[PDB]
Scaffold this motif. Structure first.
Motif, mmCIF file in Angstrom:
data_model
loop_
_atom_site.group_PDB
_atom_site.id
_atom_site.type_symbol
_atom_site.label_atom_id
_atom_site.label_comp_id
_atom_site.label_asym_id
_atom_site.label_seq_id
_atom_site.Cartn_x
_atom_site.Cartn_y
_atom_site.Cartn_z
ATOM 1 N N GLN A 32 0.765 -1.237 0.000
ATOM 2 C CA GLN A 32 0.000 0.000 0.000
ATOM 3 C C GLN A 32 0.801 1.295 0.000
ATOM 4 O OE1 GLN A 32 -2.750 -1.729 3.211
ATOM 5 N NE2 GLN A 32 -4.138 -0.390 2.054
ATOM 6 N N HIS A 134 0.764 -9.286 4.668
ATOM 7 C CA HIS A 134 -0.405 -8.431 4.538
ATOM 8 C C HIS A 134 -0.997 -8.600 3.126
ATOM 9 C CE1 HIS A 134 -3.013 -5.006 5.226
ATOM 10 N NE2 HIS A 134 -2.357 -4.601 6.300
ATOM 11 N N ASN A 179 -2.299 -10.414 8.695
ATOM 12 C CA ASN A 179 -3.211 -9.299 8.906
ATOM 13 C C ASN A 179 -4.548 -9.552 8.218
ATOM 14 O OD1 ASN A 179 -3.496 -6.353 9.837
ATOM 15 N ND2 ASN A 179 -4.208 -6.276 7.713
ATOM 16 N N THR A 183 -10.991 -10.963 6.128
ATOM 17 C CA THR A 183 -11.247 -10.136 4.954
ATOM 18 C C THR A 183 -10.501 -10.675 3.732
ATOM 19 O OG1 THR A 183 -11.908 -8.054 6.011
ATOM 20 C CG2 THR A 183 -10.728 -7.883 3.908
ATOM 21 N N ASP A 251 -9.288 -8.743 11.482
ATOM 22 C CA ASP A 251 -10.189 -7.681 11.062
ATOM 23 C C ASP A 251 -11.507 -8.075 11.712
ATOM 24 O OD1 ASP A 251 -10.041 -9.860 8.762
ATOM 25 O OD2 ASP A 251 -12.068 -9.024 8.634
ATOM 26 N N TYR A 323 -13.122 -0.880 12.244
ATOM 27 C CA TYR A 323 -13.580 0.296 11.514
ATOM 28 C C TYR A 323 -15.055 0.593 11.694
ATOM 29 C CZ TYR A 323 -9.226 -0.312 8.886
ATOM 30 O OH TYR A 323 -7.909 -0.444 8.507
ATOM 31 N N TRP A 368 -18.640 1.706 3.200
ATOM 32 C CA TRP A 368 -18.735 0.655 4.209
ATOM 33 C C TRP A 368 -18.383 1.049 5.638
ATOM 34 C CZ3 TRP A 368 -14.303 -1.355 6.686
ATOM 35 C CH2 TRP A 368 -13.092 -0.847 6.194
ATOM 36 N N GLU A 396 -5.518 -1.362 13.755
ATOM 37 C CA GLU A 396 -6.079 -0.592 12.648
ATOM 38 C C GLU A 396 -7.370 0.066 13.113
ATOM 39 O OE1 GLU A 396 -6.470 -2.458 8.822
ATOM 40 O OE2 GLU A 396 -4.562 -3.524 9.023
ATOM 41 N N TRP A 444 -5.272 3.452 11.511
ATOM 42 C CA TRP A 444 -4.927 3.055 10.152
ATOM 43 C C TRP A 444 -4.868 4.265 9.227
ATOM 44 C CZ3 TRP A 444 -2.437 0.283 7.096
ATOM 45 C CH2 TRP A 444 -2.757 0.151 5.739
ATOM 46 N N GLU A 451 -5.513 1.904 -1.553
ATOM 47 C CA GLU A 451 -6.561 1.176 -0.854
ATOM 48 C C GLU A 451 -7.161 0.029 -1.662
ATOM 49 O OE1 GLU A 451 -7.057 1.275 2.194
ATOM 50 O OE2 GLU A 451 -5.953 3.104 2.718
ATOM 51 N N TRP A 452 -6.304 -0.914 -2.030
ATOM 52 C CA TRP A 452 -6.718 -2.088 -2.782
ATOM 53 C C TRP A 452 -7.685 -1.781 -3.931
ATOM 54 C CZ3 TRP A 452 -3.042 -5.003 -1.138
ATOM 55 C CH2 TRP A 452 -2.600 -4.892 0.197
ATOM 56 N N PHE A 460 -6.973 7.407 3.640
ATOM 57 C CA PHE A 460 -7.094 6.954 5.029
ATOM 58 C C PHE A 460 -6.022 7.521 5.956
ATOM 59 C CE2 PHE A 460 -9.978 3.665 3.547
ATOM 60 C CZ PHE A 460 -10.716 3.324 4.685
HETATM 61 C C1 LIG Z 1 -13.994 -2.770 0.453
HETATM 62 O O1 LIG Z 1 -14.885 -2.697 1.570
HETATM 63 C C2 LIG Z 1 -14.341 -3.292 2.665
HETATM 64 C C3 LIG Z 1 -15.173 -3.882 3.610
HETATM 65 C C4 LIG Z 1 -14.633 -4.487 4.740
HETATM 66 C C5 LIG Z 1 -13.254 -4.500 4.917
HETATM 67 C C6 LIG Z 1 -12.420 -3.905 3.982
HETATM 68 C C7 LIG Z 1 -12.963 -3.304 2.851
HETATM 69 O O2 LIG Z 1 -11.078 -3.894 4.205
HETATM 70 C C8 LIG Z 1 -10.744 -3.661 5.583
HETATM 71 O O3 LIG Z 1 -9.391 -4.090 5.800
HETATM 72 C C9 LIG Z 1 -8.512 -2.957 5.865
HETATM 73 O O4 LIG Z 1 -9.021 -1.909 5.026
HETATM 74 C C10 LIG Z 1 -8.157 -0.762 5.058
HETATM 75 C C11 LIG Z 1 -8.826 0.419 4.351
HETATM 76 O O5 LIG Z 1 -9.159 0.054 3.009
HETATM 77 C C12 LIG Z 1 -6.849 -1.162 4.373
HETATM 78 O O6 LIG Z 1 -5.991 -0.027 4.234
HETATM 79 C C13 LIG Z 1 -6.164 -2.230 5.226
HETATM 80 O O7 LIG Z 1 -4.983 -2.691 4.561
HETATM 81 C C14 LIG Z 1 -7.116 -3.410 5.431
HETATM 82 O O8 LIG Z 1 -6.571 -4.312 6.398
HETATM 83 C C15 LIG Z 1 -11.670 -4.361 6.583
HETATM 84 O O9 LIG Z 1 -10.897 -5.201 7.442
HETATM 85 N N1 LIG Z 1 -12.694 -5.176 5.915
HETATM 86 O O10 LIG Z 1 -13.715 -5.547 6.891
#
Ligand SMILES: COc1ccc2c(c1)O[C@H](O[C@@H]1O[C@H](CO)[C@@H](O)[C@H](O)[C@H]1O)C(=O)N2O
Ligand SMILES: COc1ccc2c(c1)O[C@H](O[C@@H]1O[C@H](CO)[C@@H](O)[C@H](O)[C@H]1O)C(=O)N2O
Ligand SMILES: COc1ccc2c(c1)O[C@H](O[C@@H]1O[C@H](CO)[C@@H](O)[C@H](O)[C@H]1O)C(=O)N2O
Lengths: 491, 491, 491
Positions: A32, A134, A179, A183, A251, A323, A368, A396, A444, A451-452, A460
Motif C-alpha cells: 500500500q 499483509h 493481517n 477479509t 479484522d 472500523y 462501508w 487498525e 490506520w 486502498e486495494w 485513510f
Molecule cells: C472494500 O470494503 C471493505 C469492507 C470491509 C473491509 C475492507 C474493505 O477492508 C478492511 O481491511 C482494511 O481496510 C483498510 C482500508 O481500506 C486497508 O488499508 C487495510 O490494509 C485493510 O486491512 C476491513 O478489514 N474489511 O472488513
C-alpha cells in the motif's frame, strides 16, 4: 448534511487518560505504500500481478507500482511519526521483496531496506511492530502451486518468517504473522475482488473458476497452519531473551442484533463467530468456533491433534483491526436458502440499517464505514470475558476521505477523521476502565495509500500524500492534534 | 419502506400481563365525534365558530358539524366498545350543549343525551370516565370576555362542572377536569392553529392580534384556577360517599437528549418541565416548575397562598396523553436568541432527528407521530420517582392512518396501529414492573373523528367510520385484536 | 463535647493507598505569609490598603505587614516541607512585589526573592506549583481604574503573568491563574468583608457605594477574561517543551439537599452551579451555567464568540479548594423574595442544619467549617461524570484552631486537624477508587498565617508559627504524622 455531530471539547481524550505504558501509533502495509514494485530484484506479488493483468478490477484503475514511494521516502514516514509523537509504528514486510521467488535466495537489497527503516525508527525513539504478511503473496508461489490454496505455502511461509526473525529479530521484538485473515479469505477467494481474484463460476470476478464455498476456508486453514509453524519456530529459537512477542491481527466488525429477539441475538453470535472467531478461536483453543463447523461441515478442514495443540495459545498479543459495525439479521435454515458465498454460512446477514430503519451510525465517507464506537468496546469486552483477556492492540482504526465528496473539499481539513478517532480512542478508554487489557491504538493511515480495489480514491491517512507535488508528506488536522495530544516539543 | 418492523409474536401483550383491576378502554371528545352542532338548543363553541368563520384553517376544509354523528349514533359507539371488550370509555361533555350561553339556563336536551349514553354504557357493563372540557369552550363566553383569557372563565367553568356533578355524579365516579392543557395553550394562543386561533401580530394565524408570549400563559393560569375551584367543590359536596375521583389529563411527549452532554441533559429537563410540568407541577405542589418561572418571569402569573394550597394535591388520578417523543437540543441564552413563541421559553428545541442524524423512531403516518415507546416508560417512571407515584391512566395513545398514504390502502387493515398499540401496552407493562402505579390504558381513537386542524384526513380510530356508508362503525384489525385480547365471547 | 470521634486506626490512610505519581503537599499565599509589605520597593496591594485604612474590618485588628515573615524566613518554610516529606509546595506570587505600580517597571528585588524560593525548593527535591493571583491586587491599579471592576485589568494581568512566565517558567511547570474566584467575588464585592471591601449602599462594609448584585459578576467576568488571555499566551509562547500545565483553583463547598424532595434536589444543583459552575463551566465550555444566566440575566456579562472559544478547554489542571459542605434549601421565585446579595441569585439558601435539625457534620473550630468529607467525594465524582474528568488537585483542604477555644489548649496538639485531614485524604481515595482523576492533595496551612478578616485568631497550619518566639516554625502533631506517612528518614 450529512449531519456529523462532533464531541464536546471536554469529551476529547487526553494522553493521560491512558497510563505511561499505553502505546499510540499508526500502521501501513508494504504494497500500500512502498512502490518500487520491481526495483533492486524484488519479485512480483499476487497484487502486482492482479493489478497488471486485471487493471479494470481497481476502482480508479491505478495500482501499487509506486504508491507513496516509501521504498525511497521512508525517512519522511519516520519524520511524520516523530512529528505526531507516535511511540510505535506498525509496518509490513514484503515477502516478494525479501524472497523474489517466494523461496530460495534472499534479496539482500530487500533486507537492507528494512534494516534502514528499522534503524531509523529506533534512532527516532519509535518502536517497530512488524506484520509479516499483509495479503502480500509472491506470485511465483501463486503460479507454482496456487499460493495459499496449497499446503506447501505452510513451510514456504515458515522459511520466509525465519528470514525475518534472523535478520530483524535483534531489534524487532513484536510481530504479527498475518493481517486481516477473514477479509483476505472473503475478498480474495469468496467475492474475488482482491488478488488473486477468484470466485465461483458464474460470479463476476477476474478469474471465476474457483469455489466461493470452499477456497476461502482452504486458504484460511493454511494461514492458521502457517501461523502455528512460524510461532513454534519463533518460541523455540528466536525468543532466547524472553522479551519478544508474536501474534496475529484480526479484522473485526462489531455487531448488534437487527431486531430485539433471541433469534437475532443468536444471529449476532454467529456473526461474531464468523468474523472474529474464524481465526481467533483457533489460536486460542486450537479449533474453529463450533457454530462454523456445524454449518460448514466438510467444507471446513479438520485440524490434527498435533495442529490443535500447536495452535492453542499461539498468540502473545492480539491485534484488532476495527472500523465499523453492522446489525445481524437472522436467516433460517430452509429449502428457500442456499449458500453460494462463504459469508452465507453464518446464516446472519450483515445489515447497515436496523429494524427501525435507521443506519447503525453516521457515514464517514467510504460506503462501508459507518461510525459506531460502541461496537469496539463490546468486542474488547468479549476478548476479556470470553477469551481470557489477552493483551490487545487496536492495530487498525480510521476512516477514508473519498475523492468527489464535496463535504471534504480540503484534504488537510480532516476534522471528521479526527472526531472519529477521538471517539474510538475514548471507546478504548471505556474498555480499559472495564478491565479489558488493551495495550495500544494504531491509527490506520499513517499516510494516504493504495486502498486495494478502491485505488487512491480513498484517503485513510493522518498524513496527506500530495501525489501532484512529488508524493510530499503533509500533516492533516488529525496529525496535528496528535502532536498536541502527545505533547511534542514545538520548533 | 417505510420499513416497519413488527413485534415477534411472543412479545405481544396478553391481558393477563396486567392484574384484574387494570383497565383497558378507548377515548373520544365531544366536538370530535358528536355532530349536531346546533341541534336541540345547543349553542356554538369556539370550534364551531373557528371552523365556520375561518374554514380554510382546516386542512381538508371540513368541520365538526356532523363528525361521526355520535349525538344520534352513540349506541353504535357503545356496541363497538362492547364488541372489543373494553371495560372503560372516556368521553367528554360539550359545555355549549349543556349551557348554550356558557352560563345560565341548562339545555335539558343536552342533559338527556349524556344520561342516555351513561346509562347505556352501564347497561353494557362499561364504566364511564368523563372529561369535563376538551378545548370545547362556549363561543358565547368567548365573545363576552375573551373566554379563557379572562378570569371570569374560572367561576363560569366551576358552575358548568357543578351542573355535570349534580346531573351525572350519581353514576359517573371518575372525572378529568381538562384535557391536554399544554397543547391547547400552545396551539390556540401561541401558533394560533386551533380555536380561537390567536397569535402575535405578524404571525400567520386566523386572528393575529394576540401575544404568543403571554396569552398561552394567561389561558393556562385560568385553566389551573378553574380546575382548583372545581375540585374543591367536588371534594366538598360531590364525594359524600368517598368513592369518586377527579383529576386532569396532560398531553406529554417523551424526551431524549439530542446529544450526549450535560447541556442536553439539562435541556431535556427543561423540555419535560415545559411539556409536562407546566400543568402537572401546579396540581402537585401548587406552583409552576422553577425553570419556567426563571425563564418566563412576569409573563407567567403568580399564584396566591390560597390558590397554591387549593392546587396542591388537587388530583386523585392523573391522565397521560402519549403519542410520541423528541430529542431535546439545548439553546443558549444570548443576544442571538429572542423568544417569539411561548415554546421558545424552554430554551430547548424539540428535534425529530438525533445528533447522529437518525429519526427518534419509525414514522407512523401523520408527520408528528414517530414511534418511541421507551419515552412513555420513562415519563411514567418520572411520575413515580419524582411526583409521588400517583394513580396514572394513559388517557390517550395511538396513531393516525393518513389519507393519501399508499402504504395504507385498506383502512381496516391497520396492522401498523396494532403493532404500535401492542408496543406501548408493553411499555406500560415495563413501567408497572418497575413500580409505576399505572391503572389503565385508553387508546385514542374509539372511532375515526374530526382531528382538529387536520380534519378527517387523519384516522385515529380502532373503529372505522364509513363516511360514505352513513357513518357506519366497522371494526378494524386493531379492534378485532382487542376482542381476542379481552376474551370477548364469540357469536 | 463537642463530641469529636476519631477514625479507627485501621481506617487511617497510608501513603501506598495512592500510586507513586500522586502528590502530597501544602499551600500558602503571598499576603498571608510573606510580610515585608513595603520592603525593597514592593508597592501596596488592595489588602495592604484595606487593612491600613479600615483596620477595624479585621477581627483581631491585625494585618499582613509581617505575617509569618516568609519574605525573610522562606528557608524555614522549605525545611518544614522537607521535614514532612511533602513532594509539592503551592505558593502565590505577589503582584505588587513584582510590579509595584501594577504595570511598568519590574521590581528586581521581587524577582530575586521568588527565584531564591524556587531554587531552594528544587534543591530540596520539592516541586513548586505557582498561583499567579490570590486576591493580591496592586492598589495602584485599584486607584487608577477600580481594579477588577475595569476591563483594563485584563491586559494588565496578562502582562503580570508574562513576567512570571519568562522569569520562572524555566523551573516552574505548573500554574494556577487565580485562586478561589467565587469567594473573592462574594466577599470583596458582595458582602464587602474582603478588600477592597465594597457592597451596596445601606449594607455594612468598609465602602458601601458599590452594588452587591452587579460588581461581583463584573469582577468575575474580568477574572475569566484575564485567565483566558494569560492561558492563550502561555500555550502560545511559554510551553515550547510541551511539559507545562496551567489551570485555575476553585473554592467549592459540597451540597446535600436540605429536605428529600425534587425541589431541594434542584436547589442543590443551583448551589453547585453557583459555587463551582460560576467559574468552572466557563473554562470548560466557554460560558456560565445556564441556571445563572436564567436567574441573573443582564447582571451577568455575555461572552463574545472569540472569548467563548478562548475560554473553552483553557485548563490543563483543575484546583479544588475544599473545606466544608452545606444543605441546599429551595427558595421559590415570588414577590416575597427579592435578591440583594449576589448569592441570593441561586434561589437556594446554604444551611448548616438539615431538615431533621442536625448539623451537616461536626464543627472543627472556626464557625464555617463543619466536617463533611463525603461532600468532597461527591464533587470529585461530578468533575468526573459531568465535566470530562480532567486532572484534579485538592489545592486547599484543612481546618482552623481558634484562639479562645479551650478544647484546643496546646496549639501543637492538633489531633482534630489530623483526623479531619486523614478523613479527607480517605475521601479522595474513595473518589480515585471510583475513577476520578485526582492527582494530589495540598493541605491548606503549610504554616499558620493571616486569615484575612479573621486575622491570626485562626490557625490553619500543619506547622505552628510562634509569634512570641520570633515567628519560629514548630511542627504540630499533624505535621509529624506526615513525616511518618511519607517515610521521611529519621535523624
Ligand atoms: C472494500 O470494503 C471493505 C469492507 C470491509 C473491509 C475492507 C474493505 O477492508 C478492511 O481491511 C482494511 O481496510 C483498510 C482500508 O481500506 C486497508 O488499508 C487495510 O490494509 C485493510 O486491512 C476491513 O478489514 N474489511 O472488513
Ligand atoms: C398537529 O400536530 C400535533 C402535535 C402535537 C399534539 C397534537 C397535534 O395534538 C395532540 O393532542 C391530541 O391529538 C389527537 C390526535 O389529533 C386528538 O384526537 C386529541 O383530541 C388531542 O388531545 C397532542 O397532545 N399534541 O402534542
Ligand atoms: C470567612 O468565612 C469563610 C467562608 C467561606 C470561605 C472562606 C471564608 O474562605 C475560604 O477560602 C480560603 O480560606 C482559607 C482559610 O481562611 C484561606 O487561608 C485561603 O486563602 C482561602 O482561599 C473558602 O474558600 N470560602 O468558601
Amino acid at each position: 448534511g450529512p449531519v456529523f455531530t462532533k464531541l464536546k471539547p471536554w469529551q476529547i481524550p487526553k494522553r493521560d487518560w491512558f497510563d505511561k505504558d499505553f502505546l499510540f501509533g499508526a500502521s501501513t502495509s508494504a504494497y500500500q505504500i512502498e512502490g518500487a514494485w520491481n526495483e533492486d530484484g524484488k519479485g512480483p506479488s499476487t497484487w502486482d500481478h492482479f493489478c497488471h493483468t486485471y487493471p479494470e478490477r481497481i476502482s480508479d484503475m491505478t495500482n501499487g507500482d509506486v504508491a507513496a514511494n516509501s521504498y525511497h521516502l521512508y525517512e519522511e514516514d519516520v519524520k511524520a511519526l516523530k512529528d505526531m509523537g507516535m511511540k510505535v509504528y506498525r509496518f509490513s514486510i514484503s515477502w516478494s521483496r525479501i524472497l523474489p521467488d517466494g523461496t530460495g535466495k534472499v534479496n539482500q537489497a530487500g533486507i537492507d531496506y528494512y534494516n534502514k527503516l528499522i534503524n531509523s525508527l529506533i534512532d527516532n525513539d519509535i518502536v517497530p511492530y512488524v506484520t509479516i504478511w499483509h495479503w502480500d503473496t509472491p506470485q511465483a508461489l501463486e503460479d507454482k502451486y496456487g499460493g495459499f490454496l496449497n499446503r506447501q505455502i505452510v513451510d514456504d511461509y515458515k522459511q520466509f518468517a525465519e528470514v525475518c526473525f534472523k535478520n530483524f529479530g535483534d531489534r524487532v521484538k513484536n510481530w504479527f504473522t498475518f493481517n486481516a485473515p477473514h477479509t483476505y479469505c472473503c475478498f480474495s477467494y469468496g467475492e474475488g475482488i482482491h488478488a488473486p481474484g477468484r470466485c465461483s463460476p458464474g460470479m463476476d470476478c477476474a478469474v471465476p473458476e474457483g469455489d466461493s464455498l470452499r477456497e476461502p476456508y482452504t486458504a484460511g486453514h493454511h494461514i492458521l497452519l502457517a501461523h502455528a509453524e512460524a510461532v513454534q519456530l519463533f518460541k523455540a529459537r528466536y525468543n532466547m531473551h524472553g522479551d519478544s512477542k508474536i501474534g496475529m491481527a484480526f479484522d473485526v466488525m462489531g455487531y448488534e442484533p437487527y431486531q430485539d429477539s433471541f433469534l437475532d441475538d443468536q444471529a449476532r453470535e454467529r456473526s461474531i463467530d464468523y468474523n472474529m472467531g474464524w481465526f481467533l478461536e483457533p489460536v486460542v483453543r486450537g479449533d474453529y468456533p463450533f457454530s462454523m463447523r456445524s454449518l460448514i461441515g466438510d467444507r471446513l478442514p479438520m485440524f490434527t491433534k498435533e495442529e490443535q495443540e500447536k495452535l492453542a495459545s499461539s498468540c502473545d498479543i492480539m491485534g484488532l483491526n476495527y472500523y465499523t459495525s453492522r446489525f445481524s439479521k437472522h436467516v433460517d435454515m430452509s429449502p428457500d436458502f442456499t449458500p453460494t458465498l462463504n459469508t452465507d454460512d453464518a446464516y446472519a446477514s450483515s445489515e447497515t440499517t436496523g429494524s427501525d430503519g435507521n443506519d447503525i451510525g453516521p457515514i464517514t465517507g467510504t460506503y462501508w464505514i459507518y461510525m459506531y464506537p460502541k461496537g469496539l468496546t463490546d468486542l474488547l469486552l468479549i476478548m476479556k470475558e470470553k477469551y481470557g483477556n489477552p493483551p490487545v492492540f487496536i492495530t487498525e482504526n480510521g476512516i477514508a476521505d473519498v475523492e468527489g465528496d464535496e463535504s471534504m473539499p480540503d484534504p488537510l481539513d480532516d476534522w471528521k477523521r479526527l472526531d472519529y478517532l477521538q471517539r474510538h480512542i475514548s471507546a478504548v478508554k471505556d474498555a480499559i476502565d472495564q478491565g479489558a487489557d488493551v495495550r495500544g491504538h494504531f491509527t490506520w493511515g499513517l499516510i494516504d495509500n493504495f486502498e486495494w480495489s478502491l485505488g487512491y480514491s480513498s484517503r485513510f491517512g493522518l498524513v496527506y500524500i500530495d501525489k501532484n507535488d512529488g508524493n510530499k508528506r503533509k500533516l492533516k488536522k488529525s496529525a496535528k492534534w496528535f502532536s498536541k495530544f502527545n505533547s511534542v516539543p514545538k520548533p
